[PDB]
Amino acid sequence: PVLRSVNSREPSQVIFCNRSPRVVLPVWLNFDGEPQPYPTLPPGTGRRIHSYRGHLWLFRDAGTHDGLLVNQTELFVPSLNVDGQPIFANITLPVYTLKERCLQVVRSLVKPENYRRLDIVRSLYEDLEDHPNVQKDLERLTQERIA
């Protein structure tokens, strides 16, 4: 696949900094481009990671899979450490659209089986149901990359 880690075997010390109010799931793309979960980070916490140059990472809300940014972008790739200094991966909220943010809150409060009991315009039912999905995000990033 287009989006995958390279098996560089060259160590790179990384520090994951969760500068978001969410429980963050780091997702490593393996050498076949398949997303693999790593231990989550509580809000406002940092952790040292032994990663490798050319490995690919993305970050999600662990419970909802809402998208997060890392150094203000979608994917993070360790480089070789200069002067023994670790590379920082600063994980933050994006600015969600107001619509997406409202959908997040509604999903957090209502079981999926009850979405269609809500007194809202009909088009929004399908929007609630179309929850964030890492595989779809990777397809989207892949097509953006190709363009």
């Binding site: 075997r9 393996n30 693999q36 790593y38 406002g44 940092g46 952790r47 032994h50």
Partner: peptide
């Protein structure tokens, strides 16, 4: 041959 990421046994630390 294939080397995956791993997390050393260390404490997490607080930000801000």
């Amino acid at each position: 041959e294939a080397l995956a990421x791993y997390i050393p046994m260390d404490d997490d630390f607080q930000l801000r």
